[PDB]
């Protein structure tokens, strides 16, 4: 009865984004898989902290299903996800089973390279407006988290608590996210 | 004329409070070394991240002196900080060069441990601030950020951004700060 998610780790993907929802959700008693792109090697993100994942994606796609697929920002850590034909398969397979797909800052370009979602209201970073927006295929929000069935974006790396809650929200409900926040000292 | 960190990473650690300032300094153009204190091995967060330190902490201490040491938060990291001789010998050096010291969430406990800074005017996680009021030796505050002489403290997780721009501010000054802010996408 434990819900699960898949977190796809990238060289060059933005620690900050990545380390918020994996921590977050863990709060919440979801299981949390970090999965390394390229393996199970320690992977250097964007401002050079050193992360080791829990598996390589390869073994991780084995485990699923997962409750939501999670896709950290970092311009080349994004480029990595857009390029990746195994990153491609998972998402179809998620869109597909209708399970939720979560992407921040530069993190939801991957779904346009991918074309995950076509139709859909999303958010981006201000500066990865334009590469989202290249043919018209989605409607553009500039609210901080926006969800539209089952894409749900945020803008940048200050938006990760918000972004990593709403996910919490989406899976457990209303009085787990709210309990969850309340020990972390939030603003709003 | 590069300002220097140093960021000393115990098992037990907050990760957010740990990945938040690393990023955000380096953003600022800080040299920030991430040090084990039990040596060059990977560390076990308290959320299970798994952080690969740039040194170990014999190594680093080599290398200052550092314009801001950082303490990390997590309850088991701020004990482990707490226990440990080689930190009391760092905080005290940092001390008598009047450098800056900041500590977030459970993390400013080390200094009590220490005997860190008495008198200043400190803050805390809510459910440290009997252990770190014991004795009397502080006066509390309930800041968001507080920054009483050289010692600089913060409440949690969600203080974070907050806690790290403010030791962008005092060791790079207002616009560094304000430039650095921009791209993060915070509310406030």
Same mark, same amino acid.
């Given at each position: 009865a434990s819900k699960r998610a898949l977190v796809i780790l990238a060289k060059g993907a933005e620690e900050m984004e990545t380390v918020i929802p994996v921590d977050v959700m863990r709060r919440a008693g979801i299981k949390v898989t970090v999965a390394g792109l390229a393996?199970?090697?320690?992977?250097?993100?964007?401002?050079?902290?050193?992360?080791?994942?829990? /598996?390589?994606?390869?073994? /991780?796609?084995?485990?699923?299903?997962?409750?939501?697929?999670?896709?950290?920002?970092?311009?080349?850590? /994004?480029?990595?996800?857009?390029?990746?034909? /195994?990153?491609?398969?998972?998402?179809?397979?998620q869109e597909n089973r209708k399970g939720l797909i979560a992407a921040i800052c530069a993190g939801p370009t991957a779904l346009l390279a991918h074309e995950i979602g076509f139709g859909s209201k999303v958010t981006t970073h201000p500066l990865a407006k334009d590469k989202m927006m290249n043919g018209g295929h989605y409607t553009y929000s500039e609210n901080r988290v926006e969800k539209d069935g089952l894409i749900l974006t945020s803008r940048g790396p200050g938006t990760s608590f918000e972004f990593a809650l709403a996910i919490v929200e989406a899976l457990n409900g209303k009085e787990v996210a709210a309990q969850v926040k309340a020990p972390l000292v939030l603003k709003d």
């Open positions: 393996g199970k090697d320690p992977v250097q993100c964007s401002r050079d902290v050193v992360i080791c994942p829990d /598996a390589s994606l390869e073994d /991780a796609k084995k485990e699923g299903p997962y409750d939501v697929v999670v896709l950290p920002g970092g311009n080349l850590g /994004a480029q990595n996800l857009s390029e990746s034909a /195994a990153v491609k398969e998972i998402l179809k397979e």
